[PDB]
Design a protein around this ligand. Structure first.
Ligand code: NA
Length: 151
């Protein structure tokens, strides 16, 4: 089964050590609600080797598998640290308070691979320019495992 796709932009300003992630939209999200659709929001976790650092989240959209956000989030990551971090993006279905029901997950950073690594590398090769890219969502537990694999 397909979990969905997410589009976000990445921008790095090396002088200021400012990392900006804009959650743009998601599409083809898995239906999570019985009979219904999903109520998606997106968490953005800045991590280091799968260890928590800073956490942010989007607003919640109701009853949609194709949410449009255009919500920006910024993180302070000094130049010397930018190849040590992981930007972890999780789409969840809001259902009840305090309960996390993940639809799918992906991360970018130096220890990511494939199209995730490409997005990260394109960001670094284009300082100060926001680079937008689509990503296929994966199962949370599979992404969590990969966060622990260092290059
Ligand atoms: Na990957």
């Amino acid at each position: 089964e397909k979990l969905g796709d997410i589009c976000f932009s990445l921008r790095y300003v090396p002088t200021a050590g400012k990392l900006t992630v804009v959650i743009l939209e998601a599409k083809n999200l898995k239906k999570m609600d019985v009979g219904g659709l999903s109520d998606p929001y997106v968490k953005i976790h800045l991590m280091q080797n799968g260890k928590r650092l800073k956490k942010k989240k989007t607003t919640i959209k109701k009853n949609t598998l194709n949410p449009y956000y255009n919500e920006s989030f910024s993180f302070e990551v000094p130049f010397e640290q930018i190849q040590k971090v992981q930007v972890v993006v999780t789409v969840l279905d809001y259902d009840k308070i305090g309960k996390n029901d993940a639809i799918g997950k992906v991360f970018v950073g130096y220890n990511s691979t494939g199209a995730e690594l490409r997005h990260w590398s394109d960001m670094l090769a284009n300082p100060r320019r926001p680079i937008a890219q689509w990503h296929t969502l994966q199962v949370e537990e599979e992404v969590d495992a990969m966060l622990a694999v260092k290059k």
